Amino acid sequence: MDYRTVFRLDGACAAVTGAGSGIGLEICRAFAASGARLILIDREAAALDRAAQELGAAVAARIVADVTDAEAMTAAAAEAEAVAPVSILVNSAGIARLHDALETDDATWRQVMAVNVDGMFWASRAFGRAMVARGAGAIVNLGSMSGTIVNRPQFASSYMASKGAVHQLTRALAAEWAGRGVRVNALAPGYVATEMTLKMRERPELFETWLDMTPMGRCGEPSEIAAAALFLASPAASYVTGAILAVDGGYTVW
Amino acid sequence: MDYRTVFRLDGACAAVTGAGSGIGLEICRAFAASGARLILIDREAAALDRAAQELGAAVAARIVADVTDAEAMTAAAAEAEAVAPVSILVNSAGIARLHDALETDDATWRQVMAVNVDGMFWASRAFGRAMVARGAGAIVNLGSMSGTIVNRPQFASSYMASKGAVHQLTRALAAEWAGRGVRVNALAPGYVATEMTLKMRERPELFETWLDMTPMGRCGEPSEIAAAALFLASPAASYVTGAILAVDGGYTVW
Amino acid sequence: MDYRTVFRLDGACAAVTGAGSGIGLEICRAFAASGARLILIDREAAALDRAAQELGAAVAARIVADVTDAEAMTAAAAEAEAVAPVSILVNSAGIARLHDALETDDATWRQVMAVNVDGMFWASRAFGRAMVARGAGAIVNLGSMSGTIVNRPQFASSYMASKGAVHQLTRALAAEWAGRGVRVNALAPGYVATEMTLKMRERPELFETWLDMTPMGRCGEPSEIAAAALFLASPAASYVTGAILAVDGGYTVW
Amino acid sequence: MDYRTVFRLDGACAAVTGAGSGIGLEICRAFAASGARLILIDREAAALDRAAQELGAAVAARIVADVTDAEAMTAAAAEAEAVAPVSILVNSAGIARLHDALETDDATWRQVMAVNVDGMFWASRAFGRAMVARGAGAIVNLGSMSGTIVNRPQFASSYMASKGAVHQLTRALAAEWAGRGVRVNALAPGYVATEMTLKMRERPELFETWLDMTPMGRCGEPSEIAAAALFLASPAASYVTGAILAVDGGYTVW
Numbered sequence A, B, C, D: 001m002d003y004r005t006v007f008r009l010d011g012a013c014a015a016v017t018g019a020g021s022g023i024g025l026e027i028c029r030a031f032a033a034s035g036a037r038l039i040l041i042d043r044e045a046a047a048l049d050r051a052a053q054e055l056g057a058a059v060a061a062r063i064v065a066d067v068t069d070a071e072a073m074t075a076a077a078a079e080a081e082a083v084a085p086v087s088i089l090v091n092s093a094g095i096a097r098l099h100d101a102l103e104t105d106d107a108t109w110r111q112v113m114a115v116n117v118d119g120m121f122w123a124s125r126a127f128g129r130a131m132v133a134r135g136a137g138a139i140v141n142l143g144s145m146s147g148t149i150v151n152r153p154q155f156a157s158s159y160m161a162s163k164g165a166v167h168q169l170t171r172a173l174a175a176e177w178a179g180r181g182v183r184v185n186a187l188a189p190g191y192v193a194t195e196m197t198l199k200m201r202e203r204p205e206l207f208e209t210w211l212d213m214t215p216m217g218r219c220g221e222p223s224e225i226a227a228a229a230l231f232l233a234s235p236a237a238s239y240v241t242g243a244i245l246a247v248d249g250g251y252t253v254w
């Protein structure tokens, strides 16, 4: 090991879902900086072209796809493999809807589980195929502190359920592909200052509880989550598989 | 304070999904014997009459219903509340399908998540509505050791993820309803000698591994899991909510 | 299994450390009620004779011993075995001292670790000997939510460390003696309304945080912890070993 | 935001206990290479000069000290702060002793807890005093997979408990010091090829079990653990506190 460059991704190609926004985009930045070539994936065209414009030459492909469409993920991988061999997958596509359990409509529940969990499996199966064949790769899933504990004061039982699945999916694929050289880990972030959370931050009857419940007393910055993903996705994490890495300002300690 | 009857369910009415087979049936027996009345729910009509014929007078209703059909769970709660106020719910309806991640049909993934996760939500929302209203209720979810660790040597990634979701779902509804007097807990059984594990117990290249990995060196008995559901469901467990109780012969210890 | 009497301890003898107060004494009550004969252990003579006076004929022996003195535990077991064969051990002797980490005196730290952890091992080794020889027994340790998360707002790093050890000691002995028929589990209680906590309850700048941090919004009652121990120590828990059972009003869910 | 140097330790001074051997030494190498200066601490004087002779100019001091001696850690912090303000602490000093629970000498139990647990507290209190004062610091504790699960087939109950205490100690000091800008995290390595595991790696009735139980089918390399300590210690991990990071080749996954 050469510690100086062991955190770099030189030569590597990363597929990132949810690349057009928030944490997904900051990981694209981090990975570009680190020597990686990129495959940007996002359902949102406007967002994607912005991502790509900014990331410039590190962009191998930019693909408009919904992670819940499993043949779009199979198609995306095939495209990917032609263009650059993909050795890293970051599953950042996710959504969160507030709801009370007794006033949940079936579509809200089904959709959160479809994006957060099904989509993550479809992407991991599509891209993990070529990794498992080469006997080499790394996957990093965006879980949440919500896969460990339950947020307060707001209710979103479908998000909590989805993040529980995410953590165990992570471990299930880690165990299954360990012997064949693919590592799979998850980040479990606390509150992060991105697009997913701005609406919730503008109400102080919520934001105040948030910070008082977090030992560091602040939201994380997207770059703080990106750095953790960078670590997990790089050769520095070569003995790290099936791990749930908490990046939460201590929220889960209390 | 009466310790000799703290574990009893006298004058309660419990709804049990998966009542037709294995652990769900043993639970009904356990609850019948502790003085509860039973609302029995299974998609298998044949299994239901057998269950009901055996339970006798303890049976207040038997309802053929697919837990994945949200509007059928809601109706089932309506029917059940009309016979007697339902103060206990056991979500035991569930499936397992073996599959290699790379060779997974979309439909297998979808269906395991539908029954194990979506179905538990649909039932819990339907039956918990009146409990929340009353300020009183106990729900027992069938989680698994598979929501904490990953089984070997067989592969079933959908199952691990579904059980991750079961544990977080349990915790989310525990948190949301604690203030209104409804407790929500899960069991995380190890291998149990039932119908769900018959095909696999017939295969020593799986079976000898199972016992080896189990400190107690044996499968659990359906009644060992039932006794533990009885605890969670009873007044004995009145300060226990959001708990995931391992009943696994030490499996998650190693 | 006969569910009606499966929670009873008829014929059994339980050694309980910390029997003179709080949770230890309420478990003596619960176990007496349930058909068990008792060995009371406590360093405090006044407390012990009060315990024994109240528990009456269920008391086989009453022994004044400090759990940190390992030959007193070896001696106590030998005495025990002459008088009644001890098939159940409850480790409830424990202490808690508030301190700031940077203003901790070495004696406070050493003493908490000595009572909470060393004492628990000395008792478990002394009494577990005869259980392991018979190939039968049950141990229940008093862990804490403090072995999982960190209390707030008060500081007691030595208590948190001690409870971490307690949970893993539990699992280590469960794994070691599983094959030889001794089960070992821990309770991890939340705030409980006993002697250990009255001082802390009388300051509202503390008590208020406590309840607001607990989903059920109340302290537990000693009987709620006793019922859980009763469950773990009885034949109902026969497939339950190495488990950490949270009894905390949901405190660890959030 | 500079991802190319986020993992660097330029201008920091790190104190490492257990610097003389195995993982503690590899960590020093890692930190030396990331631009940090080193305060080296070990009870073995011989091992220290070897460490220091190899590290070269990166070594600001080498201090022979027994971590179990509280007043020696305090003095060591005083000495170290006088050379350069210490902003990183790695608590790597630790031992393992195999013993059957029933045949355990008191002294073995005591000594494993003294080094692994008490010693980490003494060092963390001593070095964290000035860090807390500065409003800035990172501590990395050497936890273990043995603080989460129990090893097999060999028995070492003191070690499992000590590591339980290490994980909760880490979390307690994370919570207490988060508001004053000192992060505190632990690693939970799997088997690592070092001096601590040489005797046991020589015994195939243990060794073949070790690898079988490890999804990655191999021991970790000291440098794989070091790379992960570097992450925790660096600005890359700035929103990570109270985390227990598994570096175990998937061991805790099964």
Ligand SMILES: NC(=O)c1ccc[n+]([C@@H]2O[C@H](COP(=O)([O-])OP(=O)(O)OC[C@H]3O[C@@H](n4cnc5c(N)ncnc54)[C@H](O)[C@@H]3O)[C@@H](O)[C@H]2O)c1
Binding pocket: A017, A018, A019, A020, A021, A022, A023, A024, A041, A042, A043, A044, A047, A065, A066, A067, A068, A091, A092, A093, A094, A095, A096, A115, A119, A142, A143, A144, A145, A188, A189, A190, A191, A192, A193, A194, A195, A196, A197
């Ligand atoms: N506080 C936080 O932001 C926070 C905390 C913990 C975990 N996380 C998780 O980390 C991940 C990223 O969240 P973040 O805030 O950047 O979110 P974000 O909303 O800022 O970004 C999400 C991105 O995913 C895309 N997306 C949504 N559904 C999609 C679909 N079906 N197909 C393709 N793309 C889709 C959106 O277009 C968007 O670009 C999510 O999995 C989230 O649940 C976020």
Ligand SMILES: NC(=O)c1ccc[n+]([C@@H]2O[C@H](COP(=O)([O-])OP(=O)(O)OC[C@H]3O[C@@H](n4cnc5c(N)ncnc54)[C@H](O)[C@@H]3O)[C@@H](O)[C@H]2O)c1
Binding pocket: B017, B018, B019, B020, B021, B022, B023, B024, B041, B042, B043, B044, B047, B065, B066, B067, B068, B091, B092, B093, B094, B095, B096, B115, B119, B142, B143, B144, B145, B188, B189, B190, B191, B192, B193, B194, B195, B196, B197
């Ligand atoms: N080894 C084990 O048996 C084991 C271990 C851990 C957890 N569990 C969990 O315990 C629960 C019950 O398992 P068990 O072995 O009795 O299984 P089982 O297969 O014996 O019984 C399952 C019952 O659920 C019913 N069911 C299935 N889908 C349904 C649907 N959509 N609607 C209504 N009813 C439906 C089936 O008809 C059957 O009667 C499951 O959640 C399972 O995952 C089992």
Ligand SMILES: NC(=O)c1ccc[n+]([C@@H]2O[C@H](COP(=O)([O-])OP(=O)(O)OC[C@H]3O[C@@H](n4cnc5c(N)ncnc54)[C@H](O)[C@@H]3O)[C@@H](O)[C@H]2O)c1
Binding pocket: C017, C018, C019, C020, C021, C022, C023, C024, C041, C042, C043, C044, C047, C065, C066, C067, C068, C091, C092, C093, C094, C095, C096, C115, C119, C142, C143, C144, C145, C188, C189, C190, C191, C192, C193, C194, C195, C196, C197
């Ligand atoms: N809020 C709570 O009370 C709470 C919460 C979580 C866990 N617990 C744990 O459950 C257990 C019991 O606490 P509880 O409130 O009854 O405490 P308590 O102080 O009411 O009772 C403790 C008893 O243990 C005895 N004791 C203390 N040190 C001893 C020693 N060295 N040898 C023998 N006896 C000794 C005391 O004499 C007393 O009778 C402890 O392990 C405690 O840490 C308590």
Ligand SMILES: NC(=O)c1ccc[n+]([C@@H]2O[C@H](COP(=O)([O-])OP(=O)(O)OC[C@H]3O[C@@H](n4cnc5c(N)ncnc54)[C@H](O)[C@@H]3O)[C@@H](O)[C@H]2O)c1
Binding pocket: D017, D018, D019, D020, D021, D022, D023, D024, D041, D042, D043, D044, D047, D065, D066, D067, D068, D091, D092, D093, D094, D095, D096, D115, D119, D142, D143, D144, D145, D188, D189, D190, D191, D192, D193, D194, D195, D196, D197
């Ligand atoms: N398989 C593994 O090696 C493994 C796995 C998980 C965790 N760990 C943990 O990592 C840490 C370091 O282990 P490692 O294998 O390098 O061990 P090692 O035995 O190679 O190195 C331990 C170092 O600590 C020093 N030391 C011991 N007692 C001391 C004391 N009282 N004061 C000062 N120094 C003392 C020793 O001299 C030695 O240099 C330990 O806490 C260990 O429990 C090791």
Ligand SMILES: [Mg+2]
Binding pocket: A149, A251, A252, A253, A254, C149, C251, C252, C253, C254
């Ligand atoms: Mg919490």
Ligand SMILES: [Mg+2]
Binding pocket: B149, B251, B252, B253, B254, D149, D251, D252, D253, D254
């Ligand atoms: Mg395991």
